[PDB]
Design an enzyme around this catalytic site. Structure first.
Site, short mmCIF file in Angstrom:
data_model
loop_
_atom_site.label_atom_id
_atom_site.label_comp_id
_atom_site.label_asym_id
_atom_site.label_seq_id
_atom_site.Cartn_x
_atom_site.Cartn_y
_atom_site.Cartn_z
N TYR B 155 -5.83 4.81 11.16
CA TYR B 155 -6.26 3.60 11.26
C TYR B 155 -7.86 4.22 10.59
CZ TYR B 155 -7.55 -0.85 10.47
OH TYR B 155 -8.55 -2.68 9.82
N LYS B 162 -13.61 -2.59 11.11
CA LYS B 162 -13.33 -3.58 11.52
C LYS B 162 -14.26 -4.37 12.56
CE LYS B 162 -9.73 -4.68 8.86
NZ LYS B 162 -9.76 -5.66 8.05
N1 LIG Z 1 -1.98 -6.22 7.15
C1 LIG Z 1 -1.68 -5.66 8.29
O1 LIG Z 1 -0.95 -5.80 9.44
C2 LIG Z 1 -2.93 -6.68 9.05
C3 LIG Z 1 -3.26 -7.03 10.41
C4 LIG Z 1 -4.70 -7.65 10.79
C5 LIG Z 1 -5.80 -8.08 10.09
N2 LIG Z 1 -5.00 -7.58 8.04
C6 LIG Z 1 -6.22 -7.94 7.62
O2 LIG Z 1 -5.68 -9.30 6.67
C7 LIG Z 1 -6.55 -8.09 5.15
C8 LIG Z 1 -5.69 -8.78 3.96
O3 LIG Z 1 -4.83 -7.80 4.39
P1 LIG Z 1 -3.45 -7.94 3.82
O4 LIG Z 1 -2.80 -6.93 5.03
O5 LIG Z 1 -2.87 -8.92 3.18
O6 LIG Z 1 -2.75 -7.20 2.24
P2 LIG Z 1 -3.34 -7.64 0.75
O7 LIG Z 1 -2.36 -6.00 -0.55
O8 LIG Z 1 -2.28 -8.52 0.59
O9 LIG Z 1 -4.27 -7.98 0.39
C9 LIG Z 1 -5.07 -7.94 0.32
C10 LIG Z 1 -6.39 -7.82 -0.86
O10 LIG Z 1 -7.38 -7.16 -0.87
C11 LIG Z 1 -8.09 -7.23 -1.89
N3 LIG Z 1 -9.17 -6.97 -1.80
C12 LIG Z 1 -9.30 -5.40 -2.08
N4 LIG Z 1 -10.41 -4.65 -2.75
C13 LIG Z 1 -11.10 -6.20 -3.14
C14 LIG Z 1 -12.06 -6.43 -3.66
N5 LIG Z 1 -13.75 -5.28 -3.69
N6 LIG Z 1 -12.72 -7.79 -3.58
C15 LIG Z 1 -11.77 -8.57 -3.83
N7 LIG Z 1 -11.19 -8.33 -3.34
C16 LIG Z 1 -10.13 -7.30 -2.60
C17 LIG Z 1 -7.20 -7.05 -2.71
O11 LIG Z 1 -7.28 -7.30 -3.99
C18 LIG Z 1 -5.99 -7.64 -1.88
O12 LIG Z 1 -5.57 -8.95 -1.95
C19 LIG Z 1 -7.26 -7.72 6.06
O13 LIG Z 1 -8.35 -8.05 6.06
C20 LIG Z 1 -6.40 -6.85 6.79
O14 LIG Z 1 -6.82 -5.84 7.29
C21 LIG Z 1 -3.74 -6.99 7.60
O1 LIG Z 2 -6.24 -3.88 8.81
C1 LIG Z 2 -5.22 -3.33 8.51
C2 LIG Z 2 -3.87 -2.89 9.64
C3 LIG Z 2 -2.72 -3.22 9.57
CL1 LIG Z 2 -1.94 -2.49 10.43
C4 LIG Z 2 -2.29 -3.38 8.14
C5 LIG Z 2 -2.91 -3.42 6.87
C6 LIG Z 2 -4.06 -3.93 7.22
O2 LIG Z 2 -4.80 -3.63 5.77
C7 LIG Z 2 -5.58 -2.66 4.90
C8 LIG Z 2 -5.55 -1.27 5.73
C9 LIG Z 2 -6.32 -0.12 4.92
C10 LIG Z 2 -6.48 -0.50 3.34
CL2 LIG Z 2 -7.33 0.28 2.22
C11 LIG Z 2 -6.54 -1.79 3.04
C12 LIG Z 2 -5.91 -3.04 3.74
CL3 LIG Z 2 -6.24 -4.69 3.21
#
Ligand SMILES: NC(=O)c1ccc[n+]([C@@H]2O[C@H](COP(=O)([O-])OP(=O)(O)OC[C@H]3O[C@@H](n4cnc5c(N)ncnc54)[C@H](O)[C@@H]3O)[C@@H](O)[C@H]2O)c1
Ligand SMILES: Oc1cc(Cl)ccc1Oc1ccc(Cl)cc1Cl
Ligand SMILES: NC(=O)c1ccc[n+]([C@@H]2O[C@H](COP(=O)([O-])OP(=O)(O)OC[C@H]3O[C@@H](n4cnc5c(N)ncnc54)[C@H](O)[C@@H]3O)[C@@H](O)[C@H]2O)c1
Ligand SMILES: Oc1cc(Cl)ccc1Oc1ccc(Cl)cc1Cl
Lengths: 257, 257
Positions: B155, B162
């Site tokens: 990560y 974060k």
């Molecule tokens: N996926 C997980 O397990 C997880 C866990 C905890 C937190 N999160 C968080 O959730 C959030 C969303 O991530 P996600 O998992 O839904 O993946 P996602 O691919 O569905 O969405 C990520 C988004 O980031 C947007 N983005 C990236 N660069 C951008 C920019 N320059 N301007 C505007 N938008 C931009 C993307 O377009 C996209 O919509 C993040 O903050 C992520 O870290 C995800």
């Molecule tokens: O924060 C996250 C945490 C987990 Cl477990 C899975 C996906 C996540 O989301 C990201 C991780 C790396 C990049 Cl480049 C962009 C995003 Cl949205």
């Protein structure tokens, strides 16, 4: 002292008030060989003076803003210290305009960038550049502040850079632990230094921690030095990735009238 | 629903697997007028379709890396919603070369800067541009991850972005609180989204997680959506500056097998 045979690089000494100075002074007293770095020509002279008083003659220029400066510095140190046992990171900065008034209004993209670059990234940048130079049993130490945990007025963006710093400590500790390197941070309380004057309403922020702190007094650069000397000695062999508060208990109390 | 009479802007919707998508279904379900934004034209189409099914024809473009793109977006939005009740910040990014392998070796000054800029600064940048358009009782929500609290493999630098992001939540809530605005964050557990495949070894980071988790299953964009809807409604008017863990209780357990 419990630091004999150790060679540590100390950064961020700017005056006799600097925290890094209390740290250098305490480590010197415990038998460690010191090395110092100065940011620019404005500080070179006073750093050489201090280094002399602490029996050191290794005084190198280093601006954590440029990777080149860092690489050159470590390549110069390597001439006298092919290997050493860690360094003290006591560096921080953010444009003045950032630390005054409403947080949301004062913060800008640039100020944010600068604050995170100089105050959080510079710690890993330095570790990356000297990684192969560090001996087993080495310790790396940085200095944080409560602003990282709670939202403090005027501290603003620095608070965010510090949270990032403390997170760095945990990722660095975990990354370098197998090689035998420990990484920790001291979260010191308010101290009357040179950069502490850049924060609006500070003379008051000290009088507050004064009568609210369990030990009923603020910490001194001596208090911090002792804790850093220890955190960098083989006595703390079982401590890594930790952020220990040296604020006299101020953070674990609430509503002391 | 408990969101009737609320106008919320949702960002970060890229597919049906997006967390932001799960959040929009829940809010609209609870009777909320939504507005969607898309990063670039490659996603303009998808977002428009999703917006249509959720009773919305407000689809603006917005790239958080640009102050101007954020300015225009709220300028356009101001034509329909001269005033609204908050937004959901579901945005994060870092070059793939930062998310794989030893942290100290992977991290670069550039990678660091970008990660903090897009994943942390953008959140406060959006609040700056719409601060005058928010109604009393507005709510701001962002998404974080346990990596900001602990050192999690691969990560890497995203963990520091974060922590800055979670500190940003406390500084924002403290600054905007007296204006009737609440700022909170949800620390979500591993979910199979479109950007999750960007993390080195995720399917196994998810297989492990749903095994040692108290509830014995990984959360879904549903569980997250529902908590999101709640954190944005007046039903959570007593909560601000908090980071709630919607990860089935994984972060509290230790040593299970
Ligand atoms: N996926 C997980 O397990 C997880 C866990 C905890 C937190 N999160 C968080 O959730 C959030 C969303 O991530 P996600 O998992 O839904 O993946 P996602 O691919 O569905 O969405 C990520 C988004 O980031 C947007 N983005 C990236 N660069 C951008 C920019 N320059 N301007 C505007 N938008 C931009 C993307 O377009 C996209 O919509 C993040 O903050 C992520 O870290 C995800
Ligand atoms: O924060 C996250 C945490 C987990 Cl477990 C899975 C996906 C996540 O989301 C990201 C991780 C790396 C990049 Cl480049 C962009 C995003 Cl949205
Ligand atoms: N003073 C306090 O109450 C207090 C409390 C908690 C943490 N800290 C931390 O202690 C550390 C030192 O602060 P201080 O109180 O000793 O103030 P200080 O003014 O005495 O020293 C600050 C140092 O930062 C160095 N520096 C700034 N930019 C640099 C750069 N680009 N490259 C290399 N060096 C640079 C300066 O040159 C200077 O030596 C900081 O991390 C600071 O935030 C201080
Ligand atoms: O972090 C700090 C916390 C306190 Cl209570 C007092 C001084 C501190 O240190 C700084 C604050 C702002 C800038 Cl620009 C540079 C530095 Cl070294």
């Amino acid at each position: 002292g419990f630091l004999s045979g150790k060679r540590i690089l100390v950064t961020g000494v700017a005056s006799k008030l600097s925290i890094a100075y209390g740290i250098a002074q305490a480590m010197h007293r415990e038998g460690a060989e010191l090395a110092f770095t100065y940011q620019n020509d404005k500080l070179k002279g006073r750093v050489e003076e201090f280094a002399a008083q602490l029996g050191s003659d290794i005084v190198l220029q280093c601006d954590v803003a440029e990777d080149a400066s860092i690489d050159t510095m470590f390549a110069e140190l390597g001439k006298v210290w092919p290997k050493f046992d860690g360094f003290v990171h006591s560096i921080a900065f953010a444009p003045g305009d950032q630390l005054d008034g409403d947080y949301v209004n004062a913060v800008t993209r640039e100020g944010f960038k600068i604050a995170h670059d100089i105050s959080s990234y510079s710690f890993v940048a330095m570790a990356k550049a000297c990684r192969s130079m560090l001996n087993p049993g080495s310790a790396l130490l940085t200095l944080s502040y409560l602003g990282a945990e709670r939202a403090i007025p005027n501290y603003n963006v620095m608070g965010l850079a510090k949270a990032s710093l403390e997170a760095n400590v945990r990722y660095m500790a975990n990354a370098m632990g197998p090689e035998g390197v420990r990484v920790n941070a001291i979260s010191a309380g308010p101290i009357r230094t040179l950069a502490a004057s850049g924060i609006k309403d500070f003379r008051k922020m000290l009088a507050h921690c004064e009568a609210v702190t369990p030990i009923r007094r603020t910490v001194t650069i001596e208090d911090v030095g002792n804790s850093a000397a220890f955190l960098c000695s083989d006595l703390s062999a079982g401590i890594s990735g930790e952020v220990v508060h040296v604020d006299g208990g101020f953070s674990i109390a609430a509503m002391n009238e």
